[PDB]
Write a structure and sequence with these properties.
This protein is α+β, with helices and mostly antiparallel strands and about 60 residues long. The protein is built from 2 helices and 2 strands; from the N terminus they run E-E-H-H. The protein has a two-stranded antiparallel ribbon with strand order 1-2. It binds one DNA strand of 118 nucleotides through helix 2. The PDB classes it as dna binding protein.
Length: about 60
DNA sequence: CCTTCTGGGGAATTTTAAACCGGCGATTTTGGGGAAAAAATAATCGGCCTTGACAGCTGCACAGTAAGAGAATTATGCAGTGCTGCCATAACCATGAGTGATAACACTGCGGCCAACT
């Protein structure tokens, strides 16, 4: 639930940001939002974040 | 009435069984050397089992003590100036010794001149 993709739960239903909704309709992909304060529903990407931040960005210097 | 037979006992002798001690023949044991095998120890390999973390981030508040940073104040050491006295150095002359110089020959460095290529 990022404000760059939504604008709050209008009584349970989600209100999509108009510009982002236009962007999604342009590329055709349907957006979805998991839920407030529940990151389990997107465990794949969070675990990938753990993977990258404990494998790549641990000692690499730039 | 007498003679002969037999039996018991003490002494001498012989044989066989048992036990010890020694000698002789055999196996065992100890030591050293060489080879082979087993096991022990360490290191390296693969893989299974299980769980932590990834989910915005951490800066601030209070407690006490100590340190330190900045500014004002104070102490002290350097410097400056005047007057007098003492020590150093410098100036001259003489004599000895060292080095810079001068002559001569030989080798090398630099400038003037000639030629070859583009």
């Amino acid at each position: 639930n990022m404000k760059t993709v939504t604008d709050g739960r209008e009584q349970g239903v989600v209100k999509w940001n108009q510009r982002f909704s236009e962007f999604a309709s342009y590329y055709g992909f349907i957006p979805k939002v998991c839920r407030p304060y529940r990151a389990q529903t997107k465990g794949k990407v969070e675990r990938a974040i753990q993977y990258i931040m404990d494998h790549f960005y641990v000692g690499t210097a730039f």
